[PDB]
Nucleic acid binder design. Structure first.
Ligand SMILES: Nc1ncnc2c1ncn2[C@@H]1O[C@H](COP(=O)(O)OP(=O)(O)O)[C@@H](O)[C@H]1O
Ligand SMILES: [Mg+2]
Lengths: 95, 579, 93, 107, 86, 93, 107, 98, 88
DNA sequence: ATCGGATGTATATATCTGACACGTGCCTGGAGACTAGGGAGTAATCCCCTTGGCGGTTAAAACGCGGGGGACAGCGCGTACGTGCGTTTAAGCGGTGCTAGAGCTGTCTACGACCAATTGAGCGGCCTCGGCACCGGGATTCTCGA
DNA sequence: TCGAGAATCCCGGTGCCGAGGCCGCTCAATTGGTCGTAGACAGCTCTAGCACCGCTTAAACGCACGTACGCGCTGTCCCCCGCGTTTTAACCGCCAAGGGGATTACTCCCTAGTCTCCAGGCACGTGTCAGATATATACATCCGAT
């Protein structure tokens, strides 16, 4: 049996080497076309539109998680917590 | 008399033709040309025209009884002139030479104003800071029974004096410095100011000086100016002095300019000079320095027309062609090439003879200093740039002489200590470096006898003050001015402009008081003196209309000048392997 | 119909800087969008620059200044060298 | 009177006529100079070649012949100048630079 | 269209997907409260981008959201996207 | 030496909003810069919006869409309403 | 006939004609409509009225009767959406909102 | 024994008095000299207007104030009250400069 | 003597005195400052100044002038995304 | 330290599918007159810059010192995560049909551009008088050692 | 724990300077008329987005257990803050002379735009092959427990 942290590093090396999308397609499409109904009724989405939304979204989330990791490291930890995300977003100017 | 009673007379608790009519009545007793200004500022200022349309002899022979000690006869005539000026509702400037004694005359005039017509103040006296103390002493020495204060110090001391004595009106004289006058005008604007006296009126030259405007905001019943040299460089400054002295008359600068200077009449000469003498005679009083003193023997001013050095020529030509952003750089090069960055050969630096021959002026300077060292004199170089003065100090060290340097960055106590030790009895102090516009007028270099103006100034008054640093009353042996000029260079231009200014001053003011490789230094001196006589004979007979031409022959030319002077592929990332 | 693109020119450049490799279609689309983006940025900067100076024409001078003003460090000087090379070769023909 | 393209006269690979038309119809200025399209096309060609050579090198380092968006992302992010130029740009089907903070590694 | 509007689709962004995103971002150990925060920030970002895209498509008098509309919205927001035209 | 600016118009708006209230010169210059900046933003957005749709005119619809894209949330709608109001009034006379 | 400014025709205070000229001369499009200047002028007037009212209230709070850049800064940064509009702008001679973190305060 | 303020109670007073004023906190002449020195390294023989230096000073001071706000947030996040260069570096790196 | 070698004129960046950084930090709202802040602050200020002045000089050199104006600095700041109100 | 597992890591083979090559045509870029207006060059001019130096004030900055409180390291612990197993449950693809709804083509007409005169509106120059800054001084409030 | 003590604030008074009316001019807006030409509407087509729907099957979910990491407490330096000299540098006021950039007015010329044709260049539609997966398959290479 492996020890805590080994498999985490193996997953880190595995997912920093691949390029695919890490969110399933139907859940994200359902979320997108549920959100979009708040602005206009009877909207149709091309596949390319949802694909672009998903790739932009995943890029944003990865870039946010890098800053969250750096904040948590700066606070003398290895575990990312919600206050790290809040600090990163506040510093970056989004909140 | 009483403080509370005197508060009724000093403080101002509250087109003045009343005295203006009498002023004009007496002033028009002279030539009607005086009314010219008025007949101009009647069309521009009709409200002041209401005076032109409608239209005691007190010799005071002997010295005043109330003053201590005896008073010199020429100063007696000075106070007579001052009293005459007062009893006419007009004001004049006193322009006696420095060291002749003017504070005594002014305080005797104040004693007159307090004891003969009984107006004990208020009086304001504006003087340079270094001079301030040298007033109270005389005020306490010649007429002791009068109160005065200097009104100086930090915010607390000055505010305490303002609350205590000035507003309390426990004073007769409020002697105060220029910067203090500017600093506190509001507390000083309400005293009603019987008289205002300005020693060293050179400061009040520019009409738009902050001090000038501040003084024009005051209220004075009569004014007066004390100065050693009016009309320093230009004429317009004389008009500014007159305008401050009498603003109701000299109210148009363009009038005084176009009538005389700004448009020179096609007349030859010798008429307008009589016009000016008639205009200024009632106002300006002046006496020759050598008038009643004797003793000090006239100055033997001399020029040394040095040539120029090979490196000096190379650098000067390098400057002429086009990091350097003034013509004064030329003045640096003809002064000493080492002032520029890079002139010194080799980043290791030495102090041996390798600099004496590299500069043209300093070669002759070294020769003269050696001749005087085995002749027994003392010198007072007055360069104009402290950086060159520093280089000359390094020279003085190499040749093993004794410093004494007082620049503009020398602390006051260091200044006085240097003056004392040099002026001390027999001592190892040969050379006394000093920058020309330093020390004000309280420097008393009477011990030495030889002065060397290393460079020439734009206005000759600065050089005259440098000369008076050693030619004052006191030093009674000899005076030798040895100004150095680089020929075939911009120094000729600066010397020409200075000489023309000095000649203009001699014509205007100095005519009223009449009625009131080695160069073999011997041959160099002979030819330089011959050239000085050449310029003197050339320019002495020039015309007044030409005195203001300011030919401004450009020195940018001096010899013939047209006034015109791969991709590398980048570093690349080595390995792109993900592993 | 007949959608214009930069594919042919990017391919011609690729087969002179790496004359054995290839390029996928997604990579070609990315390169096309990159070329369009850089063109638009340079052109907009040049237009604003000409508008500031009251001029009404875009010249090689504004393009050079916009290049020097958008690209960082060594890219700016290399691009300027290439542009001036091309212009001087063009005018002499 | 044989027709010679302006690209041939300038010695470039990118089109000068198309760039001229895009400048003219893009509403950038009232007038467009003659050397502006040439200069801009040269700059675009240089930038394309510069990025594309680095992409090719990255492709070769991974034992590949055709370049894919991953190689473009690696070339852009590893080079300081291009990473500064495309700082606010995300690349589809790209990825991230392999980078683990040293504190996280085992001791 | 009328496709029987659903709920709790933000829960469709499941825990392992967030963990995979964190691993790609370089995160070793993950707290248990972080998933709700991630869902919230994702919802905010999506709302902004979709609002801009819907405005762009409404201006064109269309009913279909195209990839170019999303690209324009991202560019307007300062998040340029390469690979979907333009 | 004539320099156009939105000084008198800002002053009129202020004196119809706060009838007794002045404004310093620095504040006036800041207001002028703000107006110019917002004008440039809206005009640029409308220009790009019209270029996207292959149109040649900037009409009121483009301005409305641009102001809807830029102004945040509840601030936009009021502005939009105001704009429409003006146009209707302007097209009645 | 008799002239009537388009601003008064639309009941505005900002200049419709000047806006139209700046819109045609700014090289935004080949043509500009007739209602575009009116719409844009109305929008600008609304925005300036909002910010001026907020600044006037701020100035009145400080017992002063002129608007100064401090009041403009203080009005902008205290409204969340007006602050989102001007998030990246610096107001010369403005300042900072009074803000001390609660952790720093004395216990 | 003269009265003495506890460490940190004058810092708060300075905080709340400098954060209420509007003036520039850097002396004019040193900043002007620094600007000229930096500029002369790009192309020789430039001259500035007073307004150019003033605008540049306003921009730089605003930038530094914002950076220090983010630095304070970083320091507080780490259970500290003292700002250290680690915090400036983290704030700048998150913010996107470096 | 050798006094013709005046002085280093230490450095203009040191003209940004420690009290100035402390005042800027107080306006930012910090309570305690480590001793090493005063070097990092000078470094970041110098970097920002070089970045802005490079663009300003480019703008003023394209216009074929030799005098950097306030408008040039405003243009540079706007290009970097730091719009500044109050100078034109 | 050594050994037993689990996990990347090379290595060979079949695929297919996506990239590359080749034929059509049409549309756009190039060649050649003609023109007019934008910009480059000339020249006053004049206001403000440049360098070197001086004198004086007055806050700010630099240096020194004491002492408190804050950061930093160490220890203990007790949750809160990571890791591995079974079991469903929902995604992902193929297949199908429907039809709204983008996208291309023709007409025309209403609307913006252009031009000529004219005139009110907006900008520059000027004067002045309230609003705000500065300075006592008196009261208020918070702080810190009892 | 209250009683000094220090800092802040709120009132009067000056006083001064700049904002805000007021007047002249000139030059963009406005009005009226003519003229293309975007774009708006009507029509036709064919394409992909919506809606299910079954199979599969691979990841998600719930559950256990057992480390190790986050947090709290305690000591100890040490370093930064508050306060007191005192020293100097910013900041005015000056002097002296240039000349050097920036800013209007004229002049004109040469370089763009605008046309009219007319051929190549490039975009679309096809038909091939080899580069990169996918499986297996054996190898070497950390991790963790004794
Ligand atoms: N009894 C006296 N009569 C005349 N002059 C005197 C008498 N006693 C002293 N003096 C001189 O009067 C001089 C005043 O002149 P000075 O101090 O040089 O200033 P200024 O040159 O402005 O008059 C003093 O130097 C002092 O030596
Ligand atoms: Mg005297």
């Amino acid at each position: 049996r492996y020890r805590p942290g080994t498999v985490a590093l193996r997953e880190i090396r595995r997912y920093q080497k691949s390029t695919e999308l890490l969110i399933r397609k139907l859940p994200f499409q359902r979320l997108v076309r549920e959100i979009a109904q708040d602005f206009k009724t009877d909207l149709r989405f091309q596949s390319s539109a949802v694909m672009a939304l998903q790739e932009a979204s995943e890029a944003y989330l990865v870039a946010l998680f890098e800053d969250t990791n750096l904040c948590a490291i700066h606070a003398k930890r290895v575990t990312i917590m919600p206050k790290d995300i809040q600090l990163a977003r506040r510093i970056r100017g989004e909140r | 008399h009483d403080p509370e009673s005197n508060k009724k007379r000093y403080l101002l608790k509250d087109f003045d033709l009343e005295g203006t009519t009498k002023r004009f009545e007496h002033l028009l007793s002279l030539s009607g040309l005086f009314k010219h200004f008025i007949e101009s500022k009647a069309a521009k200022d009709p409200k002041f025209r209401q005076v032109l349309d409608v239209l005691i002899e007190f010799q005071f022979r002997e010295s005043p009884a109330y003053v201590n000690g005896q008073l010199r006869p020429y100063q007696i005539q000075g106070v007579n002139w001052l009293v005459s000026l007062h009893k006419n509702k007009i004001a004049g400037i006193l322009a006696d030479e420095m060291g002749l004694g003017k504070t005594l005359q002014t305080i005797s005039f104040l004693g007159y104003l307090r004891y003969i017509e009984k107006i004990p103040g208020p009086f304001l006296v504006i003087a340079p800071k270094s001079t301030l103390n040298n007033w109270l002493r005389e005020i306490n020495r010649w007429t002791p029974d009068v109160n005065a204060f200097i009104l100086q110090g930090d915010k607390e001391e000055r505010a305490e004096l303002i609350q205590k004595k000035l507003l309390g009106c426990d004073f007769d004289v409020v002697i105060a410095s220029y910067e203090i006058i500017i600093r506190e005008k509001s507390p000083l604007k309400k005293i009603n100011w019987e008289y205002i006296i300005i020693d060293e009126a050179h400061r009040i030259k520019n009409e738009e000086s902050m001090l000038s405007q501040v003084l024009r905001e005051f209220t004075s019943r009569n004014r007066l100016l004390i100065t050693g040299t009016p009309l320093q460089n230009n004429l317009h400054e004389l008009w500014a002095l007159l305008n401050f002295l009498l603003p109701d008359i000299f109210s148009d600068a363009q009038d005084f300019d176009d009538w005389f200077s700004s448009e020179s009449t096609e007349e030859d000469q010798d008429k307008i000079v009589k016009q000016l003498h008639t205009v200024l005679q009632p106002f300006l009083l002046r006496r020759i320095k050598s008038d009643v003193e004797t003793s000090l023997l006239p100055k033997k001013e001399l020029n040394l027309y040095v040539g120029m050095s090979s490196m000096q020529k190379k650098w000067y030509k390098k400057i002429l062609e086009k990091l350097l952003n003034i013509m004064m750089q030329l003045r640096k090069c003809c002064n000493h090439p080492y002032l520029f960055d890079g002139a010194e050969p080799g980043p290791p630096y030495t102090t041996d003879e390798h600099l004496v021959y590299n500069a043209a002026k300093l070669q002759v300077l070294d020769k003269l200093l050696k001749k005087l060292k085995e002749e027994g004199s003392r010198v007072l170089i007055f360069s104009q740039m402290s950086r060159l003065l520093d280089i000359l100090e390094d020279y003085c060290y190499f040749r093993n002489y004794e410093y004494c340097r007082i620049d503009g960055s020398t602390a006051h106590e260091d200044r006085i200590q240097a003056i004392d030790d040099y002026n001390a009895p027999d001592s190892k102090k040969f050379v006394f470096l000093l920058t020309t516009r330093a020390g004000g007028l309280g420097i008393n270099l009477t011990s030495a006898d030889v002065v060397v103006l290393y460079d020439s100034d734009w206005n000759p008054q600065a050089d005259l003050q440098a000369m008076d640093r050693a030619h004052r009353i006191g030093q009674k042996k000899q005076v030798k001015v040895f100004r150095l000029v680089t020929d075939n260079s911009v120094e000729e231009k600066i010397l020409e402009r200075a000489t023309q200014k000095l000649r203009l001053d001699q014509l205007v003011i100095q005519q009223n008081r009449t009625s009131l490789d080695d160069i073999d230094l011997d041959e160099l001196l002979l030819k330089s003196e011959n050239k000085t006589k050449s310029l003197n004979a050339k320019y002495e007979t020039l015309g007044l209309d030409d005195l203001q031409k300011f030919n401004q022959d450009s020195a940018y030319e001096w010899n013939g000048q047209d006034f015109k002077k791969n991709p590398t592929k980048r570093e690349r990332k080595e390995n792109y392997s993900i592993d | 119909t007949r959608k214009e693109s930069y594919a042919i020119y990017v391919y011609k450049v690729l087969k002179q800087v790496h004359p054995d490799t290839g390029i996928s279609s997604k990579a070609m689309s990315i390169m096309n969008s990159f070329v369009n983006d850089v063109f638009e940025r340079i052109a907009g900067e040049a237009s604003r620059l000409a508008h500031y100076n009251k001029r009404s024409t875009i010249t090689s001078r504004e393009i050079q200044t916009a290049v020097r003003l958008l690209l960082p460090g060594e890219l700016a000087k290399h691009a300027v060298s290439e542009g001036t090379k091309a212009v001087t070769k063009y005018t002499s023909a | 009177a044989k027709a010679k393209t302006r690209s041939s006269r300038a010695g470039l690979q990118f089109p000068v006529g198309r760039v001229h038309r895009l400048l003219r119809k893009g509403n950038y200025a009232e007038r467009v100079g003659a050397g502006a399209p040439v200069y801009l096309a040269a700059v675009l060609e240089y930038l394309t070649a510069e990025i594309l050579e680095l992409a090719g090198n990255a492709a070769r380092d991974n034992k590949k012949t055709r370049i894919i968006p991953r190689h473009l992302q690696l070339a852009v992010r590893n080079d300081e100048e291009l990473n500064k130029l495309l700082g606010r740009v995300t690349i589809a089907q790209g990825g991230v630079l392999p980078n683990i903070q040293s504190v996280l590694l085992p001791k | 269209r009328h496709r029987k509007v659903l709920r709790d689709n933000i829960q469709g962004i499941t825990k392992p997907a967030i963990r995979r995103l964190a691993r790609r971002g370089g995160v070793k150990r993950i707290s248990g409260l972080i998933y709700e925060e991630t869902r919230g920030v994702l919802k905010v970002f999506l709302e902004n981008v979709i609002r801009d895209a819907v405005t762009y498509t409404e201006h064109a008098k269309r009913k279909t959201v195209t990839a170019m509309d999303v690209v324009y919205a991202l560019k307007r927001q300062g998040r340029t996207l390469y690979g979907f035209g333009g």
